[PDB]
Every structure is written in structure tokens, then in C-alpha cells.
């Protein structure tokens, strides 16, 4: 459970972030593509992308940065209070897209290695623990929801 404190952390940052949705979704898609190339196996859309050069050009995967990116916005600023958000998302990403949850870890990775890169006066360490307990949190209510559908693994 995050104190309020952490929460206030958290958005904190994430106000941060939404004046340029998009690029930190191109960067944080990007270094998870890079960083586990197994992770760009699971999408069709993209899997023709072989360099970083062509993912920074392809204004497909900077949509998809932007509707990942207001997914995840939209469940931290419910603090803890994100069942609604999360039942449609686990399912997919269980059931259609096949996600495992330990990709939900690299793709955590991924997002606070780029907010320290862009934000660093506002990501301090107090706010990268917070920040880290947000996405344990996002992964352990979701990793249940996997578990009841028979797909935790
Ligand atoms: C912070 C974690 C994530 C969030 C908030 C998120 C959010 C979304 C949303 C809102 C969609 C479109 C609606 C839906 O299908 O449910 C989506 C689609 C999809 N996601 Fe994620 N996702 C996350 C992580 C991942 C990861 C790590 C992978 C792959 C390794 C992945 C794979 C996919 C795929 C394959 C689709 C369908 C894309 C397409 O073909 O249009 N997701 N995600």
C-alpha cells in the first residue's frame, strides 16, 4: 500500500510527463524493445522494426507509446484504487495478447529509466522508490487477475 506520501511523488513526476506524452512513450517503448527483444516479438504492428533509427521513425509505435502512457496515467492517478482499469487491460494482455508478467516488469523498467533520464529534479530517489512501489503495485493486482484466468504461470 503506498502512503500518500509516495503517491504525492508519483504524480508528481507523472505531471511531468503528460506535456509530452508521446516522446516518453517512443522512448520508453524503445528501450523495452531494445533492452528484451522478446518483447517486440509479441507485436505484429511492429516486429518489421530492426533498428532504433526506424523505431524512432515510426509514427505507428508513437501512438502506441501515447495509448499505453494514458492507460498507466489514468490507473496512478486512482492511487491504488484502479480495479476498474485494470480488469480490461489484464485481460487482454493475458488472454489476447499473451503477455507474461514478467514483460510488465521489463516494461517498468523501462518507464522509470526514462523518467529519470527526462525528469531527474523530480525524480530523486524518494520519488524512484515511490515510483517503483506504484509499478509493483500496478504488477501485483494485475499478476491476480492472471492467476484467476490460469495464465500466471
Ligand atoms: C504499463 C504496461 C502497459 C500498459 C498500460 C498497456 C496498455 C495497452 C492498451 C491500453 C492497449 C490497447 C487496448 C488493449 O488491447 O488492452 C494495449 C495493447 C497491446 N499491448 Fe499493452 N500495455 C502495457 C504493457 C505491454 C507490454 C509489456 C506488452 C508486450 C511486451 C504489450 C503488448 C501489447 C500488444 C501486443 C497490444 C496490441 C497492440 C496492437 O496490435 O494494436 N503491452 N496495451
Given at each position: 500500500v503506498l502512503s500518500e506520501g509516495e503517491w504525492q511523488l508519483v504524480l508528481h513526476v507523472w505531471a511531468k510527463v503528460e506535456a509530452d506524452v508521446a516522446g516518453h512513450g517512443q522512448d520508453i517503448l524503445i528501450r523495452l524493445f531494445k533492452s528484451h527483444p522478446e518483447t517486440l516479438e509479441k507485436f505484429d504492428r511492429f516486429?518489421?522494426?530492426?533498428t532504433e533509427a526506424e523505431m524512432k521513425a515510426s509514427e505507428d509505435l508513437k501512438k502506441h507509446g501515447v495509448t499505453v502512457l494514458t492507460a498507466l496515467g489514468a490507473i496512478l492517478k486512482k492511487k491504488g484504487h484502479h480495479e476498474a482499469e485494470l480488469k480490461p487491460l489484464a485481460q487482454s494482455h493475458a488472454?489476447?495478447?499473451?503477455?507474461?508478467?514478467k514483460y510488465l516488469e521489463f516494461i517498468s523498467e523501462a518507464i522509470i529509466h526514462v523518467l529519470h533520464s527526462r525528469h531527474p529534479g523530480d525524480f530523486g530517489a524518494d520519488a524512484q522508490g515511490a515510483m517503483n512501489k506504484a509499478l509493483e503495485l500496478f504488477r501485483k493486482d494485475i499478476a491476480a487477475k492472471y492467476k484467476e484466468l490460469g495464465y500466471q504461470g
Open positions: 516486429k518489421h522494426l530492426k488472454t489476447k495478447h499473451k503477455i507474461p508478467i
